[PDB]
Design a protein around this ligand. Sequence first.
Ligand SMILES: Cc1cc2nc3c(=O)[nH]c(=O)nc-3n(C[C@H](O)[C@H](O)[C@H](O)COP(=O)(O)OP(=O)(O)OC[C@H]3O[C@@H](n4cnc5c(N)ncnc54)[C@H](O)[C@@H]3O)c2cc1C
Ligand SMILES: Cc1cc2nc3c(=O)[nH]c(=O)nc-3n(C[C@H](O)[C@H](O)[C@H](O)COP(=O)(O)OP(=O)(O)OC[C@H]3O[C@@H](n4cnc5c(N)ncnc54)[C@H](O)[C@@H]3O)c2cc1C
Ligand SMILES: Oc1cccnc1O
Ligand SMILES: Oc1cccnc1O
Lengths: 340, 340
Amino acid sequence: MRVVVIGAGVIGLSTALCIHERYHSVLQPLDIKVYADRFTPLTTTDVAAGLWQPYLSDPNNPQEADWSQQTFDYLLSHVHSPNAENLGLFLISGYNLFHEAIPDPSWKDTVLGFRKLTPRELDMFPDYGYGWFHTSLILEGKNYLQWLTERLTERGVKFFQRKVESFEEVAREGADVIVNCTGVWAGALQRDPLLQPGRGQIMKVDAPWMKHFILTHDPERGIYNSPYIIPGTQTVTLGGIFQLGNWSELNNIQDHNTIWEGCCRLEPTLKNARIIGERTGFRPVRPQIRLEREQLRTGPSNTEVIHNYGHGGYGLTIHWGCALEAAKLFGRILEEKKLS
Amino acid sequence: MRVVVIGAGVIGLSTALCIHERYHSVLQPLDIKVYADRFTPLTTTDVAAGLWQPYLSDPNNPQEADWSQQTFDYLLSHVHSPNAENLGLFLISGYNLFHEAIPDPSWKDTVLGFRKLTPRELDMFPDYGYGWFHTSLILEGKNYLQWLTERLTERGVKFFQRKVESFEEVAREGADVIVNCTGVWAGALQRDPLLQPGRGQIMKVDAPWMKHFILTHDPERGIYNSPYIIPGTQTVTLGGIFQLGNWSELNNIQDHNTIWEGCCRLEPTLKNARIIGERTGFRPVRPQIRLEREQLRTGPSNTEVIHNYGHGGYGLTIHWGCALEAAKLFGRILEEKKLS
Ligand SMILES: Cc1cc2nc3c(=O)[nH]c(=O)nc-3n(C[C@H](O)[C@H](O)[C@H](O)COP(=O)(O)OP(=O)(O)OC[C@H]3O[C@@H](n4cnc5c(N)ncnc54)[C@H](O)[C@@H]3O)c2cc1C
Ligand SMILES: Cc1cc2nc3c(=O)[nH]c(=O)nc-3n(C[C@H](O)[C@H](O)[C@H](O)COP(=O)(O)OP(=O)(O)OC[C@H]3O[C@@H](n4cnc5c(N)ncnc54)[C@H](O)[C@@H]3O)c2cc1C
Ligand SMILES: Oc1cccnc1O
Ligand SMILES: Oc1cccnc1O
């Protein structure tokens, strides 16, 4: 039973882990290998602040609401363990701000102590007249990736640095199952007109007095395109850039100024902050996550492919539920192959 | 009009400033001097984390409730000014934890978004079965003292390092008004059996993933004797030591282990925190603050004394209200001296 996971971002590594921990005791030769073009300092997952918050509107696929929920419940049950720091997991509260009244989010009961902003609170934000406060979680991409990595290593999973040119190439070389977690780059292996980059650019700043996240929302400009501030473990993330179809993996002066003007307007104390770093990445945007099986007809017998990609701006928020679901699909392959 | 402020902790410095800004334009020869034995790194004020939160039970003197509200309102009006960091002022949310239901506090409408804990939140704290969540402010002593100092200097207020042996000594050398801001040490200038040290000890820790304050309450061990965790700007404060009558300005191994065990039980992730510093200070405990006038019968004509001391575990919380009220008493001296 030879398994190749393509992708070493959050989706790949979590999925790889979830499959191993669930089926290594019911499969004798269960070889799991991770093939990736880039690893854990240099993926999109690394660029993310790691805040748990799904989109405000209900998911096209209501399944996604569950996957996010399961991810929250799971992370929360580990927020008070000696590991948390190593994962980069911790609790944070903060504000979602809007110009006008809007309906509560579907997830309002997943988070802790979700409530509307009282007028006292809104006065700290001239530009805003409505919003929420709640306590969520941060799972810092970098850390989380390192942790998954050493968890995978100690479980025997081998890692290889390579670009896969096609599914067949990997099946040809002997994989029985292929787990496709190639993110925004999925379409280079199998055309997907629905999958597209939402370019994001962030600034890492030194503002340790910042203890709340602050997300602003403008329907006029679109989701993820309004300034946000998200404190991390060691630094504070400044953002508010979302540009569909842009493939330029390079920091942009204009976007820098936009991050900075928006965030300073939002929180004046930020002016005396020190700029540490800046980064760009590509949310793998898609009307819904592709997470399903496909029998790839190649040679004598077809090899099995589990797709797990298109997590847009919520990959950390949802990764774990998706990983449990990929593992499920994996178990169904086994029983059909009469190996369970 | 020669004015002497005795004391350079938060009470001295804020009262000095408050008096200058309110009366420098209505008195020509208004000279203000601060006499203190210890300054801004070496005061009890500096040992304090800076959380704004009055005692749970109502004050002996209900005036104190306003003085706190006033301090809060004022600090909150500057939370977003571009000075804030220099002040060491910032917003923070957090938990008050209890073993049993208790009535809401009187200040519940001063803080932001005050509410009770939901069951989900309580599960993060086995040992506790009830509590609060709300958003407050932190005014870090060290920074705030540094800030007042530069404000006072540019106002031409002179500081002198010296231990004052008596009120007479000071009046003898020319002061018309004396502002008594000598904290826990006040009894040495005028016996006060009501005033006593509530010794405290705290650990400063490197735990920057900690974004919430956590205060625990136990009636069996009593106020400030229960473990607490309070994130600052650069470090986190570990505490929960209150000992009436203890005059030992020296870090105690036992207390160290108590802080540590209590806080680790409370937040297991603190196990891998790095210990940076440790400090001891003396809460100026007294059944109520002494903030009032006294005409001290010295030499030919008596000199006026404003007492401002005995702020216990809540000096930073209340200091501003206290200063405005000390200035008011000052205004009354002037009109009696027929000089307004
Ligand atoms: C700026 C920003 C902020 C974000 N903030 C949040 C947040 O705050 N909270 C949240 O939940 N989500 C957030 N996200 C979303 C999150 O960043 C992404 O959803 C998530 O990282 C998607 O990860 P992935 O594993 O799908 O892909 P990636 O992390 O990009 O990993 C894809 C992997 O596949 C590999 N690969 C691709 N093609 C091949 C190939 N042909 N051969 C070999 N290897 C290949 C790549 O090398 C890489 O290893 C944010 C996103 C951005 C851009
Ligand atoms: C461990 C600990 C933690 C605390 N945490 C908090 C908190 O989180 N939030 C909060 O609101 N409060 C807290 N407090 C309470 C706060 O620290 C005190 O209320 C406050 O510092 C008292 O300030 P003060 O200016 O009266 O006295 P001090 O800060 O001690 O200043 C007194 C000054 O008077 C001088 N002085 C005294 N006698 C003489 C003399 N004869 N001649 C000359 N100078 C003299 C001293 O040198 C000193 O300069 C804490 C206290 C402790 C001990
Ligand atoms: O830019 C983002 C901010 C928060 C969550 N997801 C994103 O993509
Ligand atoms: O130790 C303390 C913590 C918070 C407030 N006051 C104190 O004294």
